[PDB]
Amino acid sequence: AYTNSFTRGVYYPDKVFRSSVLHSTQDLFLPFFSNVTWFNPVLPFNDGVYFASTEKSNIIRGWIFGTTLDSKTQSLLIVNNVVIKVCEFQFPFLNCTFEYVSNLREFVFKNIDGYFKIYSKHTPINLVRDLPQGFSALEPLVDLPIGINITRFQTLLAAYYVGYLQPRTFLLKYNENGTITDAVDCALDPLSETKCTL
Amino acid sequence: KSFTVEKGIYQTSNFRVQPTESIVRFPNGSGSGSSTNLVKNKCVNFNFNGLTGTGVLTESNKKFLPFQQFGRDIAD
To answer: What region holds the BetaCoV S1-NTD domain (chain A)?
Structure first.
């Protein structure tokens, strides 16, 4: 199945504060109104992943990232007390080089220059299916320079939504408090292209 | 380039307040260096976690987000 992304998949591209200003940025984003797969099978990672999940009892809690996923290479396991491991575990439901120990949940996972970055945002909802209408930027939570090559990933236990990021240009609107309240996808349509131009 | 000056107002030089001292600061742990005391309301050469510059540091009302470390203006 598939569903409409609407305006989801927006995150703060940096840690820079801005106030009541429109800023043009070029980065990996989830294209507005794109087809996101709606649902576990092993899924490709590509250049980035937008993940979303509706939860009533915290069913989906684990994520696996890697290329082989057979203990031959580094495998990134994240289990929500958030525990993040890179052990070459042999593999799923319920040579270590790193270990860290700490409603709609939205996450952005990407790997740039050996830095695995995880952004997240949680919000209560009045619906139980499909991504609801609205806008909210995802804040960074994890930035680990592990260097794991990732070409596939899987979830570990409920339906969840998966989309893929693309190198697009976005016009972000920072309010007086530095919160991104609106975004324009420059490539969506001619009107948005005009907005970006001006 | 004259030995005689007519009545008027002439733009001659440029005034530039010079920095007093260098302020280097790192987190409460060890930012791979020794931190210095913070000096406010004075032209100083500041260095915050490797971000270097020269200017006057004043107490701000701007509300950075928890993950936000620096602030940029319209000209970036």
So the answer is: 1-198
Which DSSP category does A18 fall into?
-
> A35 at the B interface (CB within 8 A)?
no
- List the resolution, Å: 3.0
Chain A residues within an 8 Å CB radius of B67:
12, 15, 139-140
Partners of residue A121 on adjacent β-strands: A106
Please, are residues A125 and A132 in contact by the beta-carbon 8 Å criterion?
yes
- 3-state SS class at A152: strand
How was it solved?
cryo-EM
Contact by Cβ (8 Å): A85, A67: no
Dihedral (CA of A17, A19, A24, A28) sign: positive
B62 vs A16: CB contact, 8 Å cut-off?
no
- Bridge partners of A66, per DSSP, are A152
Angle among Cα B60, B50, B20 to the nearest 5 degrees reads: 65
CB A182 within 8 A of CB A7: no
DSSP class of residue A29 equals E
Rounded CA-CA distance A87/A39 in Å is 28
DSSP characters for A56-75? Answer: SS----EEEEESS-SSSS--
Rg of chain B taking only CA atoms, in angstroms: 20
Structure tokens at A123: 């919000």
**Cα separation of A152 and A94, whole Å?**
21
DSSP A30: P
List the structure tokens of A70. 């057979």
C-beta of residue A129 within 8 angstroms of C-beta of residue A104: no
